[PDB]
Tab-separated table of C-alpha atoms and ligand atoms in Angstrom:
chain	number	residue	atom	x	y	z
A	2	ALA	CA	200.857	63.982	102.023
A	3	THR	CA	201.322	64.092	105.797
A	4	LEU	CA	198.794	64.330	108.634
A	5	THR	CA	200.192	65.356	112.018
A	6	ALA	CA	198.553	65.966	115.390
A	7	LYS	CA	200.856	67.797	117.812
A	8	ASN	CA	200.285	67.600	121.577
A	9	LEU	CA	196.495	67.431	121.492
A	10	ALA	CA	194.640	68.114	124.733
A	11	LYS	CA	190.947	67.749	125.569
A	12	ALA	CA	188.988	68.145	128.805
A	13	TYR	CA	185.358	67.410	129.695
A	14	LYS	CA	183.779	69.197	132.682
A	15	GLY	CA	187.158	69.867	134.294
A	16	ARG	CA	188.569	66.355	133.799
A	17	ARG	CA	191.399	66.261	131.253
A	18	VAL	CA	190.742	63.043	129.338
A	19	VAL	CA	193.633	63.710	126.903
A	20	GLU	CA	196.768	65.474	128.173
A	21	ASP	CA	199.444	65.130	125.478
A	22	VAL	CA	198.831	62.860	122.471
A	23	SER	CA	200.777	63.203	119.219
A	24	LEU	CA	200.784	61.146	116.034
A	25	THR	CA	201.859	61.309	112.396
A	26	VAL	CA	200.648	59.328	109.377
A	27	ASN	CA	202.100	59.571	105.865
A	28	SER	CA	200.817	58.465	102.484
A	29	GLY	CA	201.567	54.794	101.957
A	30	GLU	CA	201.683	54.024	105.686
A	31	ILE	CA	199.562	52.263	108.288
A	32	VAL	CA	200.019	54.115	111.585
A	33	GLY	CA	198.335	52.847	114.745
A	34	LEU	CA	196.944	54.619	117.809
A	35	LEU	CA	196.875	51.766	120.320
A	36	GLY	CA	195.895	51.811	123.972
A	37	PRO	CA	193.418	50.527	126.558
A	38	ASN	CA	189.778	51.557	126.660
A	39	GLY	CA	189.180	55.052	127.993
A	40	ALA	CA	192.774	56.048	127.220
A	41	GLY	CA	191.819	58.866	124.841
A	42	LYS	CA	191.873	57.201	121.426
A	43	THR	CA	188.377	58.156	120.236
A	44	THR	CA	188.724	61.640	121.725
A	45	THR	CA	191.941	62.058	119.735
A	46	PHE	CA	190.126	61.023	116.547
A	47	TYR	CA	187.348	63.550	117.178
A	48	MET	CA	190.002	66.269	117.455
A	49	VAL	CA	191.818	65.195	114.282
A	50	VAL	CA	188.615	64.750	112.279
A	51	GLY	CA	187.130	67.902	113.821
A	52	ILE	CA	184.011	66.564	115.565
A	53	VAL	CA	184.882	68.161	118.916
A	54	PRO	CA	187.100	71.256	119.298
A	55	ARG	CA	190.619	71.150	120.684
A	56	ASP	CA	191.633	72.701	123.991
A	57	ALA	CA	195.350	72.665	123.156
A	58	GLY	CA	197.588	71.378	120.395
A	59	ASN	CA	197.537	71.555	116.615
A	60	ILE	CA	196.205	69.500	113.705
A	61	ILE	CA	198.382	69.976	110.620
A	62	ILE	CA	198.223	68.491	107.117
A	63	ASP	CA	201.277	69.278	104.936
A	64	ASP	CA	201.894	73.053	105.342
A	65	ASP	CA	198.342	73.842	106.524
A	66	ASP	CA	197.246	74.156	110.156
A	67	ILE	CA	193.619	72.989	110.160
A	68	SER	CA	193.115	73.286	113.915
A	69	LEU	CA	190.292	75.867	113.745
A	70	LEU	CA	188.495	74.432	110.706
A	71	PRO	CA	185.163	72.592	111.055
A	72	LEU	CA	184.523	68.969	110.099
A	73	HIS	CA	183.329	69.600	106.535
A	74	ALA	CA	186.399	71.737	105.775
A	75	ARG	CA	188.878	69.067	106.891
A	76	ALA	CA	186.847	66.485	104.962
A	77	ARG	CA	187.439	68.458	101.748
A	78	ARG	CA	191.169	68.594	102.587
A	79	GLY	CA	191.678	64.811	102.506
A	80	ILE	CA	190.619	63.504	105.940
A	81	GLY	CA	188.249	60.545	105.951
A	82	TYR	CA	186.778	59.031	109.090
A	83	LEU	CA	185.046	55.817	110.128
A	84	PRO	CA	183.610	55.406	113.654
A	85	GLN	CA	183.865	52.369	115.915
A	86	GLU	CA	180.102	51.867	116.071
A	87	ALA	CA	177.787	51.151	113.152
A	88	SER	CA	177.759	54.225	110.897
A	89	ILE	CA	175.917	52.724	107.915
A	90	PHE	CA	172.509	53.969	106.775
A	91	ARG	CA	170.470	50.899	107.704
A	92	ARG	CA	167.357	51.925	105.723
A	93	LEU	CA	169.271	52.492	102.458
A	94	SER	CA	170.811	49.968	100.094
A	95	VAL	CA	174.542	49.563	99.526
A	96	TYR	CA	174.199	51.402	96.212
A	97	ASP	CA	172.251	54.228	97.864
A	98	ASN	CA	174.888	54.401	100.612
A	99	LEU	CA	177.717	54.867	98.107
A	100	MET	CA	175.812	57.301	95.881
A	101	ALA	CA	175.078	59.227	99.090
A	102	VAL	CA	178.623	60.498	99.619
A	103	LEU	CA	179.236	60.608	95.856
A	104	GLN	CA	176.725	63.482	95.724
A	105	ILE	CA	179.458	65.703	97.229
A	106	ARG	CA	181.929	64.759	94.467
A	107	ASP	CA	181.698	67.911	92.354
A	108	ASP	CA	184.756	66.677	90.423
A	109	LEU	CA	182.508	64.012	88.851
A	110	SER	CA	179.296	64.190	86.845
A	111	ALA	CA	176.173	62.066	87.295
A	112	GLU	CA	177.718	59.442	84.992
A	113	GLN	CA	181.135	59.193	86.662
A	114	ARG	CA	179.545	58.998	90.126
A	115	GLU	CA	177.631	55.821	89.286
A	116	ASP	CA	180.756	54.566	87.501
A	117	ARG	CA	182.857	54.842	90.664
A	118	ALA	CA	179.959	53.308	92.607
A	119	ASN	CA	180.335	50.132	90.543
A	120	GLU	CA	184.126	50.363	90.856
A	121	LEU	CA	183.853	50.494	94.658
A	122	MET	CA	181.464	47.536	94.850
A	123	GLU	CA	183.766	45.266	92.835
A	124	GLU	CA	186.813	46.348	94.847
A	125	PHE	CA	185.290	45.604	98.270
A	126	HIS	CA	183.377	42.475	97.128
A	127	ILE	CA	179.871	43.824	97.725
A	128	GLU	CA	178.460	43.547	94.204
A	129	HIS	CA	176.052	40.825	95.360
A	130	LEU	CA	174.579	43.289	97.902
A	131	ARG	CA	173.829	46.161	95.517
A	132	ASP	CA	170.125	46.315	96.420
A	133	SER	CA	170.451	44.875	99.941
A	134	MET	CA	169.360	47.117	102.800
A	135	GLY	CA	172.055	48.093	105.275
A	136	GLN	CA	170.060	46.473	108.079
A	137	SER	CA	170.375	42.999	106.525
A	138	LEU	CA	174.177	43.149	106.255
A	139	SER	CA	176.351	41.200	108.667
A	140	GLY	CA	179.103	42.810	110.717
A	141	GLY	CA	181.800	42.165	108.123
A	142	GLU	CA	179.683	43.215	105.159
A	143	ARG	CA	178.568	46.388	106.944
A	144	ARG	CA	182.174	47.485	107.519
A	145	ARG	CA	183.301	46.934	103.921
A	146	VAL	CA	180.400	49.102	102.755
A	147	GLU	CA	181.247	51.631	105.476
A	148	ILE	CA	184.884	51.743	104.348
A	149	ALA	CA	183.957	51.956	100.661
A	150	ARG	CA	181.581	54.795	101.551
A	151	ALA	CA	184.515	56.708	103.045
A	152	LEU	CA	186.650	55.968	99.971
A	153	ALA	CA	183.940	57.451	97.736
A	154	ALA	CA	184.844	60.895	99.116
A	155	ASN	CA	188.330	60.381	97.581
A	156	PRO	CA	190.270	61.178	100.778
A	157	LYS	CA	193.992	61.504	101.383
A	158	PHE	CA	193.856	59.953	104.875
A	159	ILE	CA	191.352	57.373	106.129
A	160	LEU	CA	190.909	57.101	109.902
A	161	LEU	CA	189.490	53.841	111.271
A	162	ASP	CA	188.374	53.787	114.910
A	163	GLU	CA	188.762	50.119	115.887
A	164	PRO	CA	187.619	48.696	112.521
A	165	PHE	CA	188.004	45.103	113.729
A	166	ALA	CA	185.275	45.628	116.351
A	167	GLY	CA	182.175	43.461	116.059
A	168	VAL	CA	183.261	41.391	113.048
A	169	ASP	CA	183.892	37.675	112.619
A	170	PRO	CA	187.477	36.330	112.510
A	171	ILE	CA	187.127	35.936	108.722
A	172	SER	CA	186.204	39.615	108.278
A	173	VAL	CA	189.180	40.936	110.268
A	174	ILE	CA	191.617	39.271	107.870
A	175	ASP	CA	189.411	40.632	105.073
A	176	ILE	CA	189.581	44.210	106.362
A	177	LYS	CA	193.306	43.813	107.085
A	178	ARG	CA	193.899	43.041	103.407
A	179	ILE	CA	191.628	45.966	102.518
A	180	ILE	CA	193.837	48.203	104.676
A	181	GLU	CA	197.034	46.979	103.003
A	182	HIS	CA	195.346	47.701	99.663
A	183	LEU	CA	194.497	51.300	100.585
A	184	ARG	CA	198.096	51.832	101.716
A	185	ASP	CA	199.493	50.606	98.390
A	186	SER	CA	197.045	52.970	96.661
A	187	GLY	CA	198.796	55.925	98.326
A	188	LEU	CA	196.424	56.614	101.225
A	189	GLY	CA	197.505	57.222	104.795
A	190	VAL	CA	195.684	54.765	107.048
A	191	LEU	CA	195.277	55.437	110.777
A	192	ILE	CA	193.690	52.746	112.949
A	193	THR	CA	193.034	52.464	116.678
A	194	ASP	CA	192.800	49.328	118.799
A	195	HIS	CA	193.002	48.072	122.368
A	196	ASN	CA	194.585	44.749	121.361
A	197	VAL	CA	198.225	45.758	121.003
A	198	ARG	CA	199.675	42.340	120.131
A	199	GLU	CA	197.421	41.621	117.139
A	200	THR	CA	197.320	45.136	115.651
A	201	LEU	CA	200.941	46.264	116.150
A	202	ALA	CA	202.177	43.848	113.465
A	203	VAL	CA	200.432	45.673	110.597
A	204	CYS	CA	201.596	49.121	111.760
A	205	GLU	CA	204.644	50.697	110.146
A	206	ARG	CA	204.632	52.962	113.207
A	207	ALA	CA	202.358	53.171	116.236
A	208	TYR	CA	201.579	55.525	119.118
A	209	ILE	CA	200.777	53.936	122.483
A	210	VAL	CA	198.389	56.007	124.618
A	211	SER	CA	197.595	55.472	128.298
A	212	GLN	CA	195.245	57.737	130.282
A	213	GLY	CA	195.466	60.577	127.772
A	214	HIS	CA	199.281	60.438	127.703
A	215	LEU	CA	201.640	59.050	125.065
A	216	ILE	CA	203.816	56.405	126.724
A	217	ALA	CA	205.585	55.030	123.619
A	218	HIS	CA	205.868	55.585	119.878
A	219	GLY	CA	207.923	54.637	116.838
A	220	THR	CA	208.082	51.473	114.793
A	221	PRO	CA	206.938	48.311	116.622
A	222	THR	CA	210.566	47.218	117.074
A	223	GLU	CA	211.369	50.500	118.824
A	224	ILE	CA	208.123	50.358	120.822
A	225	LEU	CA	208.806	46.788	121.960
A	226	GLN	CA	212.023	47.986	123.577
A	227	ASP	CA	210.093	49.867	126.251
A	228	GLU	CA	210.094	47.283	129.024
A	229	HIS	CA	206.591	48.265	130.163
A	230	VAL	CA	205.273	47.525	126.665
A	231	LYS	CA	207.138	44.213	126.356
A	232	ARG	CA	205.504	42.941	129.557
A	233	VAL	CA	201.998	43.625	128.250
A	234	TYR	CA	203.054	42.084	124.925
A	235	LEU	CA	204.697	38.939	126.310
A	236	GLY	CA	202.086	38.636	129.069
A	237	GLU	CA	204.221	39.463	132.109
A	238	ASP	CA	202.120	42.507	133.061
A	239	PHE	CA	198.347	42.956	132.936
A	240	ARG	CA	197.628	46.693	132.617
A	241	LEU	CA	199.343	48.898	130.032
B	1	CZJ	C1	171.612	64.495	101.403
B	1	CZJ	O1	170.928	63.663	102.297
B	1	CZJ	C2	171.514	62.374	102.447
B	1	CZJ	C3	170.646	61.358	101.780
B	1	CZJ	O2	170.447	61.654	100.357
B	1	CZJ	C4	171.451	61.284	99.451
B	1	CZJ	N1	171.405	59.988	98.795
B	1	CZJ	O3	172.337	62.034	99.208
B	1	CZJ	C5	171.208	60.012	102.010
B	1	CZJ	O4	172.620	60.066	101.781
B	1	CZJ	C6	171.048	59.696	103.485
B	1	CZJ	O5	169.725	59.833	103.783
B	1	CZJ	C7	169.368	59.086	104.922
B	1	CZJ	C8	170.268	58.942	105.983
B	1	CZJ	C9	169.910	58.207	107.110
B	1	CZJ	C10	168.615	57.610	107.161
B	1	CZJ	C11	168.275	56.866	108.322
B	1	CZJ	O6	169.138	56.946	109.425
B	1	CZJ	C12	167.020	56.235	108.383
B	1	CZJ	N2	166.819	55.154	109.369
B	1	CZJ	C13	167.205	55.355	110.769
B	1	CZJ	O7	167.678	56.385	111.111
B	1	CZJ	C14	167.022	54.248	111.831
B	1	CZJ	C15	166.000	53.295	111.411
B	1	CZJ	C16	165.918	52.316	112.409
B	1	CZJ	C17	167.265	51.610	112.627
B	1	CZJ	C18	168.336	52.554	113.276
B	1	CZJ	C19	167.881	53.252	114.534
B	1	CZJ	C20	166.552	53.939	114.356
B	1	CZJ	C21	165.430	53.057	113.720
B	1	CZJ	C22	166.565	54.915	113.153
B	1	CZJ	C23	168.357	53.481	112.012
B	1	CZJ	C24	166.170	56.316	107.262
B	1	CZJ	O8	165.173	55.670	107.217
B	1	CZJ	O9	166.478	57.149	106.221
B	1	CZJ	C25	167.734	57.743	106.145
B	1	CZJ	C26	168.102	58.501	104.981
B	1	CZJ	C27	167.125	58.668	103.818
B	1	CZJ	O10	171.876	60.654	104.286
B	1	CZJ	C28	171.696	62.088	103.953
B	1	CZJ	C29	170.498	62.644	104.710
B	1	CZJ	C30	172.930	62.826	104.445
B	2	ADP	N1	181.676	63.418	125.712
B	2	ADP	C1	182.281	63.038	126.878
B	2	ADP	N2	181.854	63.601	128.058
B	2	ADP	C2	182.512	63.167	129.186
B	2	ADP	N3	183.513	62.280	129.343
B	2	ADP	C3	183.898	61.750	128.131
B	2	ADP	C4	183.318	62.093	126.872
B	2	ADP	N4	183.924	61.388	125.823
B	2	ADP	C5	184.857	60.629	126.436
B	2	ADP	N5	184.872	60.817	127.838
B	2	ADP	C6	185.744	60.175	128.827
B	2	ADP	O1	187.072	60.188	128.306
B	2	ADP	C7	187.535	58.833	128.248
B	2	ADP	C8	187.171	58.232	126.908
B	2	ADP	O2	188.137	58.526	126.021
B	2	ADP	P1	187.728	57.421	124.640
B	2	ADP	O3	188.960	57.948	123.951
B	2	ADP	O4	186.358	57.919	124.308
B	2	ADP	O5	187.999	56.029	125.288
B	2	ADP	P2	188.842	54.978	124.060
B	2	ADP	O6	190.248	55.518	124.258
B	2	ADP	O7	188.421	53.575	124.375
B	2	ADP	O8	188.151	55.599	122.867
B	2	ADP	C9	186.722	58.114	129.315
B	2	ADP	O9	187.162	58.529	130.562
B	2	ADP	C10	185.342	58.675	129.018
B	2	ADP	O10	184.461	58.570	130.092
B	3	MG	MG1	186.898	54.258	121.329
Protein backbone atom coordinates (compact mmCIF):
# COMPACT_ATOMS: atom_id res chain seq x y z
CA ALA A 1 0.00 0.00 0.00
CA THR A 2 0.95 3.68 0.00
CA LEU A 3 0.26 6.46 2.52
CA THR A 4 0.74 10.01 1.25
CA ALA A 5 0.24 13.40 2.87
CA LYS A 6 0.21 16.24 0.33
CA ASN A 7 0.96 19.82 1.39
CA LEU A 8 -0.58 19.65 4.85
CA ALA A 9 -1.27 22.93 6.63
CA LYS A 10 -2.39 23.60 10.20
CA ALA A 11 -2.88 26.81 12.19
CA TYR A 12 -3.64 27.43 15.87
CA LYS A 13 -5.23 30.76 16.89
CA GLY A 14 -3.96 32.53 13.78
CA ARG A 15 -0.40 31.17 13.94
CA ARG A 16 0.37 28.73 11.12
CA VAL A 17 2.45 26.05 12.84
CA VAL A 18 2.60 23.90 9.66
CA GLU A 19 2.73 25.61 6.26
CA ASP A 20 3.61 22.95 3.67
CA VAL A 21 4.64 19.46 4.81
CA SER A 22 4.48 16.43 2.52
CA LEU A 23 5.56 12.82 2.99
CA THR A 24 5.08 9.36 1.51
CA VAL A 25 5.59 5.92 3.07
CA ASN A 26 5.24 2.61 1.23
CA SER A 27 4.88 -0.96 2.43
CA GLY A 28 8.28 -2.39 3.25
CA GLU A 29 9.84 1.02 3.93
CA ILE A 30 11.01 3.06 6.90
CA VAL A 31 10.34 6.72 6.11
CA GLY A 32 11.40 9.44 8.55
CA LEU A 33 9.93 12.83 9.43
CA LEU A 34 12.94 14.53 11.01
CA GLY A 35 13.29 18.06 12.32
CA PRO A 36 13.89 20.20 15.40
CA ASN A 37 11.41 20.52 18.24
CA GLY A 38 8.40 22.69 17.46
CA ALA A 39 8.95 22.24 13.72
CA GLY A 40 5.55 20.65 13.09
CA LYS A 41 6.26 16.92 13.33
CA THR A 42 3.62 15.97 15.91
CA THR A 43 1.08 18.30 14.31
CA THR A 44 1.69 16.52 11.00
CA PHE A 45 1.08 13.16 12.67
CA TYR A 46 -2.20 14.37 14.17
CA MET A 47 -3.33 15.37 10.67
CA VAL A 48 -2.31 12.05 9.11
CA VAL A 49 -3.78 9.96 11.92
CA GLY A 50 -6.83 12.23 12.11
CA ILE A 51 -6.66 13.54 15.69
CA VAL A 52 -6.91 17.20 14.65
CA PRO A 53 -8.54 18.38 11.39
CA ARG A 54 -6.58 19.74 8.45
CA ASP A 55 -6.75 23.35 7.29
CA ALA A 56 -5.26 22.58 3.87
CA GLY A 57 -3.77 19.61 2.06
CA ASN A 58 -4.79 16.00 1.57
CA ILE A 59 -4.24 12.64 3.28
CA ILE A 60 -4.38 9.81 0.74
CA ILE A 61 -3.95 6.04 1.08
CA ASP A 62 -3.77 4.17 -2.26
CA ASP A 63 -6.69 5.53 -4.37
CA ASP A 64 -8.68 6.83 -1.37
CA ASP A 65 -8.62 10.41 -0.07
CA ILE A 66 -9.21 10.07 3.68
CA SER A 67 -8.85 13.77 4.47
CA LEU A 68 -12.38 14.23 5.89
CA LEU A 69 -12.60 10.90 7.73
CA PRO A 70 -12.39 10.73 11.55
CA LEU A 71 -9.74 8.87 13.54
CA HIS A 72 -11.61 5.57 13.90
CA ALA A 73 -12.28 5.42 10.15
CA ARG A 74 -8.62 5.85 9.19
CA ALA A 75 -7.70 3.30 11.87
CA ARG A 76 -9.87 0.70 10.11
CA ARG A 77 -8.16 1.60 6.81
CA GLY A 78 -4.66 0.56 7.94
CA ILE A 79 -3.23 3.54 9.87
CA GLY A 80 -1.70 2.76 13.25
CA TYR A 81 -0.33 5.39 15.60
CA LEU A 82 1.93 5.56 18.65
CA PRO A 83 2.44 8.85 20.54
CA GLN A 84 5.70 10.26 21.88
CA GLU A 85 4.51 10.24 25.49
CA ALA A 86 3.46 7.20 27.51
CA SER A 87 0.27 5.81 25.95
CA ILE A 88 0.10 2.52 27.88
CA PHE A 89 -2.74 1.69 30.27
CA ARG A 90 -0.77 1.78 33.51
CA ARG A 91 -3.47 0.09 35.63
CA LEU A 92 -3.85 -2.90 33.26
CA SER A 93 -1.50 -5.81 32.66
CA VAL A 94 0.37 -6.42 29.42
CA TYR A 95 -2.12 -9.16 28.54
CA ASP A 96 -5.07 -6.87 29.29
CA ASN A 97 -3.44 -4.13 27.19
CA LEU A 98 -3.16 -6.40 24.14
CA MET A 99 -6.61 -7.96 24.55
CA ALA A 100 -7.89 -4.37 24.79
CA VAL A 101 -7.32 -3.49 21.13
CA LEU A 102 -7.98 -7.10 20.07
CA GLN A 103 -11.62 -6.52 21.09
CA ILE A 104 -12.01 -4.47 17.88
CA ARG A 105 -10.71 -7.35 15.72
CA ASP A 106 -14.02 -8.59 14.33
CA ASP A 107 -12.03 -10.73 11.87
CA LEU A 108 -11.06 -12.96 14.83
CA SER A 109 -13.08 -14.90 17.39
CA ALA A 110 -12.51 -15.04 21.15
CA GLU A 111 -10.06 -17.92 20.59
CA GLN A 112 -7.96 -16.32 17.83
CA ARG A 113 -7.72 -13.04 19.77
CA GLU A 114 -5.99 -14.69 22.73
CA ASP A 115 -3.92 -16.69 20.24
CA ARG A 116 -2.53 -13.54 18.62
CA ALA A 117 -2.04 -12.09 22.11
CA ASN A 118 0.42 -14.89 22.87
CA GLU A 119 1.97 -14.48 19.41
CA LEU A 120 2.58 -10.77 20.07
CA MET A 121 4.14 -11.37 23.49
CA GLU A 122 6.68 -13.87 22.13
CA GLU A 123 7.53 -11.61 19.19
CA PHE A 124 8.27 -8.50 21.29
CA HIS A 125 9.89 -10.43 24.20
CA ILE A 126 7.30 -9.55 26.84
CA GLU A 127 6.14 -13.05 27.79
CA HIS A 128 7.70 -12.65 31.25
CA LEU A 129 5.47 -9.59 31.84
CA ARG A 130 2.12 -11.17 31.00
CA ASP A 131 0.55 -10.30 34.37
CA SER A 132 2.73 -7.26 35.12
CA MET A 133 0.94 -3.94 35.51
CA GLY A 134 1.83 -1.26 32.98
CA GLN A 135 2.98 1.01 35.80
CA SER A 136 5.80 -1.37 36.80
CA LEU A 137 7.28 -1.55 33.29
CA SER A 138 10.47 0.32 32.46
CA GLY A 139 10.75 2.74 29.56
CA GLY A 140 11.92 0.10 27.10
CA GLU A 141 9.41 -2.52 28.19
CA ARG A 142 6.56 0.00 28.06
CA ARG A 143 7.32 0.88 24.43
CA ARG A 144 7.50 -2.73 23.21
CA VAL A 145 4.07 -3.34 24.75
CA GLU A 146 2.85 -0.05 23.26
CA ILE A 147 4.11 -1.07 19.81
CA ALA A 148 2.69 -4.59 20.09
CA ARG A 149 -0.62 -3.04 21.13
CA ALA A 150 -0.66 -1.07 17.87
CA LEU A 151 0.24 -4.20 15.89
CA ALA A 152 -2.74 -6.02 17.42
CA ALA A 153 -5.03 -3.80 15.32
CA ASN A 154 -3.39 -5.37 12.22
CA PRO A 155 -2.51 -2.05 10.53
CA LYS A 156 -1.02 -1.34 7.13
CA PHE A 157 1.05 1.64 8.34
CA ILE A 158 2.47 2.17 11.84
CA LEU A 159 3.35 5.74 12.81
CA LEU A 160 5.86 6.22 15.64
CA ASP A 161 6.23 9.71 17.11
CA GLU A 162 9.81 9.72 18.44
CA PRO A 163 9.79 6.09 19.65
CA PHE A 164 13.35 6.35 20.98
CA ALA A 165 12.28 8.98 23.53
CA GLY A 166 12.73 8.11 27.19
CA VAL A 167 14.33 4.69 26.72
CA ASP A 168 17.75 3.33 27.68
CA PRO A 169 20.47 2.93 25.02
CA ILE A 170 19.82 -0.84 25.03
CA SER A 171 16.11 -0.34 24.25
CA VAL A 172 16.72 1.96 21.26
CA ILE A 173 18.71 -0.75 19.48
CA ASP A 174 15.93 -3.14 20.54
CA ILE A 175 13.18 -0.98 19.03
CA LYS A 176 15.33 -0.34 15.95
CA ARG A 177 15.44 -4.08 15.29
CA ILE A 178 11.70 -4.22 15.98
CA ILE A 179 11.21 -1.54 13.31
CA GLU A 180 13.31 -3.43 10.76
CA HIS A 181 11.19 -6.50 11.55
CA LEU A 182 7.90 -4.70 10.90
CA ARG A 183 9.27 -3.42 7.59
CA ASP A 184 10.21 -6.94 6.44
CA SER A 185 6.69 -8.04 7.43
CA GLY A 186 5.27 -5.65 4.81
CA LEU A 187 4.27 -2.70 7.00
CA GLY A 188 5.02 0.92 6.21
CA VAL A 189 6.85 2.45 9.17
CA LEU A 190 6.92 6.22 9.71
CA ILE A 191 9.04 7.61 12.54
CA THR A 192 9.83 11.14 13.71
CA ASP A 193 12.93 12.39 15.51
CA HIS A 194 14.90 15.52 16.30
CA ASN A 195 18.26 13.72 16.16
CA VAL A 196 18.91 13.68 12.43
CA ARG A 197 22.33 11.99 12.46
CA GLU A 198 21.29 8.88 14.42
CA THR A 199 17.86 8.34 12.84
CA LEU A 200 18.59 9.15 9.18
CA ALA A 201 20.64 5.96 8.76
CA VAL A 202 17.64 3.62 9.20
CA CYS A 203 15.42 5.64 6.83
CA GLU A 204 15.03 4.52 3.23
CA ARG A 205 13.74 8.06 2.66
CA ALA A 206 13.23 11.01 4.99
CA TYR A 207 11.48 14.39 5.04
CA ILE A 208 13.26 17.23 6.85
CA VAL A 209 10.88 19.79 8.38
CA SER A 210 11.82 23.20 9.77
CA GLN A 211 9.26 25.66 11.17
CA GLY A 212 6.33 23.96 9.45
CA HIS A 213 8.11 23.91 6.08
CA LEU A 214 9.77 21.04 4.23
CA ILE A 215 13.40 21.99 3.60
CA ALA A 216 14.69 18.66 2.21
CA HIS A 217 13.49 15.19 1.26
CA GLY A 218 14.55 12.04 -0.55
CA THR A 219 16.91 9.26 0.39
CA PRO A 220 19.56 10.20 2.98
CA THR A 221 22.21 10.41 0.25
CA GLU A 222 20.10 12.95 -1.65
CA ILE A 223 19.24 14.80 1.57
CA LEU A 224 22.90 15.00 2.61
CA GLN A 225 23.64 16.91 -0.58
CA ASP A 226 21.75 19.95 0.68
CA GLU A 227 24.61 21.97 2.12
CA HIS A 228 22.47 23.28 4.98
CA VAL A 229 21.75 19.69 6.05
CA LYS A 230 25.38 18.58 5.74
CA ARG A 231 26.48 21.33 8.14
CA VAL A 232 24.05 20.19 10.84
CA TYR A 233 25.11 16.60 10.13
CA LEU A 234 28.88 17.16 10.16
CA GLY A 235 28.61 19.72 12.97
CA GLU A 236 29.51 22.89 11.08
CA ASP A 237 26.15 24.56 11.79
CA PHE A 238 24.07 24.51 14.97
CA ARG A 239 20.43 25.14 14.00
CA LEU A 240 18.69 23.22 11.20
C1 LIG B 1 -13.49 -0.84 25.95
O1 LIG B 1 -12.87 -0.19 27.03
C2 LIG B 1 -11.45 -0.37 27.06
C3 LIG B 1 -11.10 -1.29 28.19
O2 LIG B 1 -11.76 -2.59 28.07
C4 LIG B 1 -11.20 -3.55 27.21
N1 LIG B 1 -10.24 -4.51 27.72
O3 LIG B 1 -11.52 -3.58 26.07
C5 LIG B 1 -9.63 -1.40 28.28
O4 LIG B 1 -9.11 -1.59 26.97
C6 LIG B 1 -9.10 -0.05 28.74
O5 LIG B 1 -9.74 0.25 29.91
C7 LIG B 1 -8.99 1.16 30.69
C8 LIG B 1 -8.23 2.16 30.07
C9 LIG B 1 -7.50 3.06 30.84
C10 LIG B 1 -7.54 2.94 32.27
C11 LIG B 1 -6.78 3.87 33.03
O6 LIG B 1 -6.23 4.96 32.36
C12 LIG B 1 -6.78 3.75 34.43
N2 LIG B 1 -5.71 4.43 35.19
C13 LIG B 1 -5.40 5.84 34.93
O7 LIG B 1 -6.01 6.43 34.11
C14 LIG B 1 -4.28 6.58 35.70
C15 LIG B 1 -3.99 5.92 36.96
C16 LIG B 1 -2.96 6.63 37.58
C17 LIG B 1 -1.70 6.68 36.69
C18 LIG B 1 -1.90 7.56 35.41
C19 LIG B 1 -2.43 8.95 35.68
C20 LIG B 1 -3.65 8.94 36.56
C21 LIG B 1 -3.52 8.08 37.86
C22 LIG B 1 -4.77 8.02 35.99
C23 LIG B 1 -2.98 6.57 34.84
C24 LIG B 1 -7.47 2.68 35.02
O8 LIG B 1 -7.36 2.46 36.18
O9 LIG B 1 -8.29 1.88 34.26
C25 LIG B 1 -8.27 1.98 32.87
C26 LIG B 1 -9.03 1.05 32.08
C27 LIG B 1 -9.86 -0.04 32.74
O10 LIG B 1 -9.39 0.98 27.69
C28 LIG B 1 -10.79 1.02 27.21
C29 LIG B 1 -11.63 1.87 28.14
C30 LIG B 1 -10.78 1.69 25.85
N1 LIG C 1 -2.69 22.52 20.37
C1 LIG C 1 -1.83 23.56 20.13
N2 LIG C 1 -2.24 24.84 20.42
C2 LIG C 1 -1.33 25.83 20.16
N3 LIG C 1 -0.08 25.77 19.65
C3 LIG C 1 0.28 24.46 19.38
C4 LIG C 1 -0.55 23.33 19.60
N4 LIG C 1 0.09 22.14 19.23
C5 LIG C 1 1.30 22.55 18.79
N5 LIG C 1 1.46 23.95 18.87
C6 LIG C 1 2.62 24.76 18.48
O1 LIG C 1 3.08 24.27 17.22
C7 LIG C 1 4.45 23.88 17.37
C8 LIG C 1 4.51 22.43 17.79
O2 LIG C 1 4.48 21.66 16.69
P1 LIG C 1 4.96 20.03 17.35
O3 LIG C 1 4.89 19.52 15.94
O4 LIG C 1 3.84 19.82 18.33
O5 LIG C 1 6.43 20.31 17.78
P2 LIG C 1 7.44 18.86 17.31
O6 LIG C 1 7.64 19.21 15.85
O7 LIG C 1 8.55 18.81 18.33
O8 LIG C 1 6.33 17.86 17.52
C9 LIG C 1 4.95 24.72 18.53
O9 LIG C 1 5.07 26.03 18.12
C10 LIG C 1 3.79 24.56 19.50
O10 LIG C 1 3.73 25.56 20.47
MG1 LIG D 1 6.60 16.02 19.03
